[PDB]
Design an enzyme around this catalytic site. Structure first.
Site, PDB file in Angstrom:
ATOM      1  N   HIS A  41     104.272 -15.263  -6.940  1.00  0.00           N
ATOM      2  CA  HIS A  41     104.300 -13.707  -6.282  1.00  0.00           C
ATOM      3  C   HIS A  41     104.206 -12.926  -6.712  1.00  0.00           C
ATOM      4  O   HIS A  41     104.419 -11.983  -5.562  1.00  0.00           O
ATOM      5  CB  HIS A  41     104.929 -14.323  -4.624  1.00  0.00           C
ATOM      6  CG  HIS A  41     106.483 -14.144  -5.404  1.00  0.00           C
ATOM      7  ND1 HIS A  41     107.451 -15.133  -5.465  1.00  0.00           N
ATOM      8  CD2 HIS A  41     107.428 -12.728  -5.318  1.00  0.00           C
ATOM      9  CE1 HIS A  41     108.663 -14.582  -6.102  1.00  0.00           C
ATOM     10  NE2 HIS A  41     108.497 -13.056  -5.413  1.00  0.00           N
ATOM     11  N   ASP A  83     105.826 -22.573  -7.663  1.00  0.00           N
ATOM     12  CA  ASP A  83     105.918 -20.446  -7.481  1.00  0.00           C
ATOM     13  C   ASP A  83     106.449 -19.736  -8.916  1.00  0.00           C
ATOM     14  O   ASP A  83     107.981 -19.591  -9.287  1.00  0.00           O
ATOM     15  CB  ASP A  83     107.109 -19.573  -6.437  1.00  0.00           C
ATOM     16  CG  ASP A  83     106.837 -18.273  -6.034  1.00  0.00           C
ATOM     17  OD1 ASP A  83     105.968 -17.554  -7.488  1.00  0.00           O
ATOM     18  OD2 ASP A  83     107.741 -17.726  -5.796  1.00  0.00           O
ATOM     19  N   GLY A 174     113.411  -7.707  -6.221  1.00  0.00           N
ATOM     20  CA  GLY A 174     113.441  -6.864  -7.192  1.00  0.00           C
ATOM     21  C   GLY A 174     113.450  -8.009  -8.814  1.00  0.00           C
ATOM     22  O   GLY A 174     113.647  -7.301  -9.973  1.00  0.00           O
ATOM     23  N   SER A 176     113.010 -11.286  -8.762  1.00  0.00           N
ATOM     24  CA  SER A 176     111.940 -12.342  -8.452  1.00  0.00           C
ATOM     25  C   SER A 176     111.428 -13.082  -9.722  1.00  0.00           C
ATOM     26  O   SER A 176     111.396 -11.675 -10.350  1.00  0.00           O
ATOM     27  CB  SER A 176     110.816 -12.121  -7.082  1.00  0.00           C
ATOM     28  OG  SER A 176     111.389 -11.908  -6.438  1.00  0.00           O
ATOM     29  N   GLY A 177     111.508 -14.008 -10.582  1.00  0.00           N
ATOM     30  CA  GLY A 177     110.496 -14.246 -11.360  1.00  0.00           C
ATOM     31  C   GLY A 177     112.122 -14.027 -12.768  1.00  0.00           C
ATOM     32  O   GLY A 177     111.145 -14.385 -13.437  1.00  0.00           O
TER      33      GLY A 177
END
Length: 223
Positions: A41, A83, A174, A176-177
């Site tokens: 995403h 994801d 922020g 994320s990942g």
């Protein structure tokens, strides 16, 4: 990161930031000189890659442009299944004492193991506050059967949940990942959680990197 602490100097040399404009957009991990390793995403179009690091963002260095990126074929959007995404760097990253490859897992770490999640996401929720320093929190892996009781449907066997009792005390916007990181060893990437971020007994989720290693290195190559 919510309810965390400024991460210890140069203990996260595999951690990267994906920027757009010059705004933090996502976190990520360096798998090798040509690749990150983020959530799907976080796609984009491209990408300015920051490493390493600790602070966004001085001098010395290093910014690297992306341009090319590949999302796992099974990624949804409605659900956040599979994801994860790989990002090909335009030029190679120059490994140093501040820049290193992550150790991809061989084994799926069992529920209950202590882990560490890290990132430059907001430190308060719902109230935004972005830190310049990489931030850090500790978190336990939670069994599917426990996690399932919160998030019923939404979970898949390739998602991983992490948190503390009781909280309160995980990733946020922020982040994320970003990595997570159990005795080793990258077990997951932050995928989704609650809004507002982080209270007491709804975990984060994570992307079990543990189950994609095949796809990961197949997907490089590419070129």
């Amino acid at each position: 990161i919510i309810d965390g602490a400024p991460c210890a100097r140069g203990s996260h040399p595999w951690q990267v930031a994906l920027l757009s404009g010059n705004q933090l957009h996502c976190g990520g991990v360096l798998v090798n000189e040509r690749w990150v390793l983020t959530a799907a995403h976080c796609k984009m179009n491209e990408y300015t890659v920051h490493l390493g690091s600790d602070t966004l963002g001085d001098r010395r260095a290093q910014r690297i442009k992306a341009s090319k990126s590949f999302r796992h074929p099974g990624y949804s959007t409605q659900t956040h299944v599979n994801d994860l995404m790989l990002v090909k760097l335009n030029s190679q990253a120059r490994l140093s004492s501040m820049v290193k490859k992550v150790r991809l897992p061989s084994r799926c770490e069992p529920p209950g193991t202590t882990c560490t999640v890290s990132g430059w996401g907001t430190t308060t929720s719902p109230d935004v506050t972005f830190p310049s320093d990489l931030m850090c929190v500790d978190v336990k892996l939670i069994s599917p059967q426990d996690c399932t009781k919160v998030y019923k449907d939404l979970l898949e066997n390739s998602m991983l949940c992490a948190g503390i009792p009781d909280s309160k005390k995980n990733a946020c916007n922020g982040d994320s990942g970003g990595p997570l990181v159990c005795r080793g060893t990258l077990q997951g990437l932050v995928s989704w959680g609650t809004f507002p971020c982080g209270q007491p007994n709804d975990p984060g989720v994570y992307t079990q990197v543990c189950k994609f290693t095949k796809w990961i290195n197949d997907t490089m190559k590419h070129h």
